[model samples]
Target chain A: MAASGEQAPCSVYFCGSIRGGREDQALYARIVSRLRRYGKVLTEHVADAELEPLGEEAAGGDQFIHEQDLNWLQQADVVVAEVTQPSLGVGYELGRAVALGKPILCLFRPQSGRVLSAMIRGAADGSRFQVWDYAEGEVETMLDRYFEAYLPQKTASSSHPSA
Target chain B: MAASGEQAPCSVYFCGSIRGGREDQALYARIVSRLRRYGKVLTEHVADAELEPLGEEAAGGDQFIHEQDLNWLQQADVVVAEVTQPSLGVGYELGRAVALGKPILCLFRPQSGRVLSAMIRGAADGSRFQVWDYAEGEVETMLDRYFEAYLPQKTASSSHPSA
Candidate 1:
């Protein structure tokens, strides 16, 4: 979803669990590393343990974090959110991405046995977003397929026409 | 997903925000009331202000409330969650319901300008859940249409084959 001929690589806002849940933090880190190959992951620190305290500190309180995150979101070209664990902030971020008309891709680990929210999974309403249930070692592959549409040549008229 | 002709009306586990988020308490109450027509809404007090503090009290602290809510969820026939606002507990409840293989419906008010998590909105992975985005005045009508497939006469073979 990057602009035509922009110098910056695709700016991807990668969403993952932080406060509400973080069972797959390690996986998130790995995913973020691979995502870097495709574009710039704005929220890559989601895997950082220190981010929690930083998020709570006076320097980066809730309001500050909210605003900063939304700013990153606004600058993002596409959004890739990991939904295996439910996080309210991630939910809100995805919603903001939708409202901004950014192409969104949601990934979940089905065997994690967590129920993905239907609001995130429903596609009949005609909104532009994609969802994938990836396996243990397949997240990288899934990321590849998800971003294939965003390659330079296909960026203009790929998945999610709204984008 | 209730057993064949059980004594109790299909136990409907209705989940919504309380302390963490409560922008739609009144709408939740109305939803609870409408859901009651379909079955027992175990979490009806989600709309009750008094129950909020009580849920936080010693006799029913956060731990106690969490366990009790999980118990209700375990025994529920279906889960209907309101995701218009960000709520950690509600997200957890929805995840648990997914692990339990319960039929789930996530309703969100898109017009409220609150982002719905893509985890709750993505659908291509084929999970047994449904999500609807309804207007404030159209909730009741949306609920009716959502539940029509679950009625006694319509259950033999309903709309969503996997559902």
Candidate 2:
């Protein structure tokens, strides 16, 4: 929901572990880069390698960062999260996104062969909250398919009915 | 916040790991027992010994339970969560509660000698999302203090603001 930019490219909020862990930092960059093809990736710094675990602007403090992220989350048309390692921060975002009823796509890499939380897997309704298990190469396809499901042309009627 | 129940006891949304794990089921029961002294403990089955990791009413399916939980969460006077094991489900509730700006108390037992996520610990601003590191015996005290901070009489001016 970008209220002012109805006809503009979709606003996307990308979430990943920061203070929870940074092992997937590289993967986050790749996903954010690809997400740009669809629209403005509002949280590109989520992938910033130089970004510390406390995040890029540690000076802003947690509440500021928390509020700012939610503001972005509140406005974004969709949310994509990387949860392979399961950061409480990322999980928190997922929780908020679910409550917001935003279209969400959570990507988890099972390369580690860990037991994924059933709450996420079971909750992926494939329409609103979709969860995909993929290796590196297939993510583009998932993103493409997921976004295509909610493309402006397809969803404009419901997303901004009056406009 | 229970908008219709002005003079009624508080409505507590107690969250703990269900699908994430059940080792802490007993602890959840203990906490819920204390919470009732304050008000209604909605979703009390979170501690049900037989509650599957899939949750109590698995037949209702994920979306049903998810939406139902949020409905209760939406009306709750406060949220109390146990995160020592860090269930993604519980984390999701915590994230949602933060966005809802509810008075939240998160209890963690570090008897496992694990590294707690900074997102939870650091984000504990001591007011809104309060995180307490407590063992079994200490939880009741934390709950008492947390609720006391926003006790009905003391917080009526801010929480209810009218009568």
Candidate 3:
């Protein structure tokens, strides 16, 4: 789903903790509201349970949850993840986002658990991920700055605005 | 403060969002408690703020928060900082600890903000700072592993520990 008035060619994906680390549902809602301005945000919250299953265990060496999430990841123009909560799935998603060549914006709430362990920190730093600090009531400010750099702009050739 | 009954020194400074973010007072208290098992924890909360100031804003464009904080930093074998919230002072303290040749452990909640910008990110790639990630409830597990790499076990002074 694109913005109400404009037809967006690409979609934005808001990735965050679910079963791995139960983030406040309120935070998810807040992010969704802000994300709509960027583009059509294809997220788990707004979508249905059938579309976005929670806590589905992976089957055998593979699973539907894995496949479905990857498909969503591929369809996205950019991927924004919250590393404030420690989640292996989050780490894996981050890796996938990087491999997919999508520009990544990582939001972290520094006041969560004990600081990230050395192993996780080492693994993340070895990659190209960029993380930003969180200020209370200033998430929107961070988002504004991030979107300014991340959200793609149209060129002269692409004349047709979102219909 | 040095680890009690130990020949060598070890320290753990819990990191959390201090200011400029949602004031999660509970998380900070828990972190201080758990970190104490590993080494001596030098916390501002434990400091006698009334008797001694952290830093004094002198007439010539300077500011100070506390006196004993730096003293602890100097004597500390390791510096642990909570990065849950955005603190310019914490950033400065981390910088100073590294400069003073003290082993430093930098921890932040999974969702804390990043202190560095894009230009700085380029430089941060594989830097000396010991950074880690931790989710709620899983902090103890992560801490156990990280503490090992950061502050190694102390050996007798004559036992060639450096080698």
Candidate 4:
């Protein structure tokens, strides 16, 4: 954990589905690079060109990848997952993190004319999730604010009571 | 991909949020395991668990997961995902699959007092998805009938020559 002026652990998690088959590559790259400055990103394939095509084994039959991902989730202080992909695993991880009482941030790109499921829209209306518009590229800024406000206050004066 | 004569790929992608702070673990476990008999179960925990907790490295993050998951989606003949979790990404993936003309199965488990989201309800009304109640052990039975009636059938037998 990088000690940024004695701040609390502020590691950020980026969730996406390599198994889901539908996210745009260019868009994902942009998202990853932008979020890097905010905190350490744990998702695989950090290199720009690697996004073009993941190895067949990585995309196909490696069960170990899934196991390793759970370990990172266990380490994160907070999670900010891109919630527009259709992978069931992302939902599972999100649920797991929530179970642990870790802070979460969810992002969804606009569907244009496509309508969203009632269940998902409801998740936003009923819960205190940090939701954002993916296409607008505004989620990082929003996350920054949430982190600022939610960070535990640092006590500056420990024993400064004068007689 | 396994041959049909042998064990064909049969799995259900259970979708739901762990963060809505909802308690639905037993139900989800039941759904995934029950669906396992259909084929090799490519599931969240067993398949993509490691990718879930990945923190913000942004490099290859979302794409890594998506590529892997899509391969699964393409390999399978159908997709059965729980819509009750009301997760945006799950919904997006569902929408994408539907766009690709793949058969989609949706199930929702409502809490004691909460109503199903109108959007989900509306989609059900439109035939974009079929909504079923997540009652005790009922979904398992319901799924049997649903898959039997709705899953695709390939008429590959021209073995007997018709005069």
Q: Who wins the DockQ comparison?
A: 2
Candidate order by decreasing lDDT: 2, 1, 4, 3
Give the whole-model CA lDDT for all candidates, comma-separated.
Answer: 0.60, 0.67, 0.48, 0.49
The order of the candidates by DockQ, greatest first, is 2, 1, 4, 3
Model 1: per-residue Cα lDDT over B4-46, one tens digit each:
5434456677877454224466767777788787778777546
lDDT: the better of candidates 1 and 2: 2
Off by over 4 Å in 1: A1-163, B1-7, B20-23, B49-59, B123-127, B153-163
Lowest summed lDDT window (length 10), candidate 4 chain A: A113-122
Per-residue alpha-carbon lDDT of candidate 1 for residues A11-65, written as tens digits (9 for 90 to 100)? 7788774542244567667777877766788775466534443322224334444
The reply for model 4, stretches above 4 Å from the true place, is A1-9, A20-23, A44-61, A111-116, A125-128, A151-163, B1-163
How far does residue A31 in candidate 1 sit from its true spot (Å)? 14
Listed in order, each prediction's TM-score against the native is 0.46, 0.68, 0.40, 0.42
Instruction: Specify the highest-TM-score model's number.
Output: 2
Cα deviation of B55 in candidate 3 (Å)?
A: 26
Over 4 Å off, model 2: A1-9, A49-64, A108-128, A150-163, B1-9, B20-22, B49-68, B84-86, B99-101, B108-129, B150-163
Q: Write the candidate numbers in order of decreasing TM-score.
A: 2, 1, 4, 3
- Scored against the true structure, residue A92 in model 1 reaches a CA lDDT of 49
Residue A72's lDDT in candidate 2:
74
**What DockQ score does model 1 reach against the true complex?**
0.06
- Interface RMSD per candidate: 12.0, 5.0, 15.1, 15.2
Residue-pair clash count for candidate 2: 0
For model 4, residues A1-163, the per-residue Cα lDDT tens digits are 8643444334556665443233344555666676655556665432242444454233432344444455666677667766654434445444444444267676666754222222233334224454565454565665656666665343232443443
